[PDB]
């Protein structure tokens, strides 16, 4: 199964998300065009590479 | 994808000119911020409907 890699660009804020969930925007690494909004569980800063399994889905509010 | 839908919405306003002139500043500020942020993906794309949409909204 194909794993893929991306780059965390810009941390989003002010959205109503649970403690420990952060919503962020990633640009795909090997394919320099597609950006996706996804979520993270651990602490994240700007500009770091991140592993991804599922391709198609954009994230959302986690209530 | 919602950015793309936003651009189509603006072009429909440019068809309906009278809703424009009461909200020209809001339209301009939001449109420019959206493009200036999401620039790289949008310029690296290729879509002739997008090109024509940009051309008409520019004019």
């Amino acid at each position: 199964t194909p794993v893929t890699l991306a780059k965390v660009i810009k941390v989003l804020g002010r959205t109503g998300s649970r403690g420990g969930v952060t919503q962020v925007r990633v640009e795909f690494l090997e394919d320099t065009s597609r950006t996706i909004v996804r979520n993270v569980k651990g602490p994240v800063r700007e500009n770091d590479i991140l592993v991804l399994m599922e391709s198609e889905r954009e994230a959302r509010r986690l209530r | 994808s919602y950015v793309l839908k936003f651009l189509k919405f603006i072009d429909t306003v440019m068809q309906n000119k009278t809703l424009l002139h009461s909200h020209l500043p809001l339209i301009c500020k939001n449109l420019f911020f959206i493009i200036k942020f999401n620039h790289k993906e949008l310029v690296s794309q290729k879509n002739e409907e997008l090109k024509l949409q940009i051309n008409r909204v520019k004019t």
Binding site: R14, T15, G16, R61 | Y2, K5, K8, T12
Partner: peptide
């Protein structure tokens, strides 16, 4: 309760749905 951005996006979603349907 829905947040700014999310409300805009889903409203834009429905509006674009109807406009593209009529076109």
């Amino acid at each position: 309760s829905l947040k700014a951005g999310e409300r805009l996006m889903e409203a834009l979603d429905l509006g674009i749905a109807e406009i593209e349907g009529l076109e």
